[PDB]
């Protein structure tokens, strides 16, 4: 209820239908700005962050309280401000706004780990954590396969699943 | 940008049947929601059905057990059908992308944009 | 079924004047309503999108208000260019019904 569908197809490509039927979409062919308060009148759908495995991240007043509207008022924001988290919250997040644009952001890059330069999604070039709506914010990714990985953070065993070229 | 061409106008004998096309293009799906809609010489408009990108017809019952839709995604294009033809029948038949194109407020919207160029289907003995 | 009504079913009116066409729903149909505008020999174009978004390009003359059941498309400067044929449209429910439309034409 907390996700906010704020979505704006003004040129009739077909991008917000994919939303609701995934897997249709046309190949054809085919860093990251730190985290922060993005307005919720703008992102279109789940808003993903990536620890590096994926969780959904809901509404929220700027005083921090969860804000259970769909984006619809402009007090009601993503509050996204991010720590790499072996002690924080999550590398990095990933959505789309309202005119169909996936936008992105992390902790600041920089031996070059995911653990200490991780900045989103991406881990290593290629391989790109896999998550229920991966196909639709990084579609190209489609021919992307994708095995079972496990990843350390400081410590930490963690189970995922990465999608690779 | 999508846009839609449909087949030339076929010419129909009472009691048979006619298959249009509505080949898509200049989009970002293989296949998209095509609406069928028929307006009669100079009445009005009828909708008649509808098929989703992952092929979920809906029919009008006007025209049950008459009118079928399918897709060809290799190609992009969907047809409709309309077995059983009567007079009564000769109109123009568009077809348009049903496609949901605005939220806001926790729910969706849906019109017609763009219309194929219509075909013109007589049934006439 | 799920059936649109609209009135009136034509109208004449002068170059300037203001025409009001009015939807009414046989059920609560929410929000979702569209409207279209068509001339003769060509496809309909739509014109306004849940009942009171207008489609970009579309004159700020013209303006869709209502919800539940009673719906209105008011022009508030008739201008020549909008001598055509309206037909609102339903969408709450996926079996689409269409209004009968109201051919608006110049008084003269």
């Known amino acids: 209820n907390r996700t906010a569908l704020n979505c704006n197809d003004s040129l009739n490509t077909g991008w917000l239908a994919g939303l609701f039927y995934h897997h249709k979409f046309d190949s054809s062919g085919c860093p990251p700005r730190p985290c922060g308060i993005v307005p919720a009148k703008t992102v279109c759908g789940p808003v993903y962050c990536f620890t590096p495995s994926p969780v959904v991240v809901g509404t929220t007043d700027r005083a921090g309280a969860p804000a259970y509207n769909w984006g619809e008022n402009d007090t009601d924001v993503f509050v996204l401000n991010n720590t790499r988290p072996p002690l924080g919250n999550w590398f990095g997040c990933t959505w789309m706004n309202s005119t169909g644009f996936t936008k992105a952001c992390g902790a600041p890059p920089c031996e070059a780990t995911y653990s200490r330069c991780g900045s989103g999604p991406w881990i290593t070039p290629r391989c790109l954590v896999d998550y229920p709506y991966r196909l639709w914010h990084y579609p190209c990714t489609i021919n992307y396969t994708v095995f079972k990985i496990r990843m350390y953070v400081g410590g930490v065993e963690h189970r995922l699943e990465a999608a690779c070229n | 940008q999508v846009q839609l061409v449909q087949s030339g106008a076929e010419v129909k004998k009472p009691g048979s049947s006619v298959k249009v096309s509505c080949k898509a293009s200049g989009g970002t799906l293989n296949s998209y929601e095509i609406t069928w809609v028929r307006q009669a010489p100079g009445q009005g408009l009828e909708w008649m059905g509808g098929?989703?990108?992952?092929?979920?017809?809906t029919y009008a019952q006007k025209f049950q057990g008459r009118v079928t839709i399918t897709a060809d995604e290799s190609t992009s294009t969907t047809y409709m059908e309309l077995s059983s033809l009567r007079p009564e029948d000769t109109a123009v038949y568009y077809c348009?992308?049903?496609?949901?194109?605005?939220?806001?407020?926790?729910?969706?919207?849906?019109?017609?944009?763009?219309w194929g160029q219509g075909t013109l289907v007589t049934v006439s003995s | 079924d799920i059936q649109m009504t609209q009135s009136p079913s034509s109208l004449s009116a002068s170059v300037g004047d203001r025409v009001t066409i009015t939807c009414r729903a046989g059920q609560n149909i929410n929000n979702y309503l569209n409207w279209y505008q068509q001339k003769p020999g060509k496809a309909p174009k739509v014109l306004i999108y849940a009942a009171s978004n207008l489609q970009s390009g579309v004159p700020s003359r013209f303006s869709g208000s209502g919800s539940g059941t009673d719906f209105t498309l008011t022009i508030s400067s008739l201008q020549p260019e909008d001598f055509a044929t309206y037909y609102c449209?339903?969408?709450?429910?996926?079996?689409?019904?269409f209004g009968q439309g109201t051919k608006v034409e110049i008084k003269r």
């Open positions: 098929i989703t990108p992952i092929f979920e017809t």
């Open positions: 348009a992308r049903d496609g949901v194109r605005y939220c806001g407020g926790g729910r969706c919207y849906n019109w017609f944009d763009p």
């Open positions: 449209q339903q969408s709450h429910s996926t079996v689409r019904t």
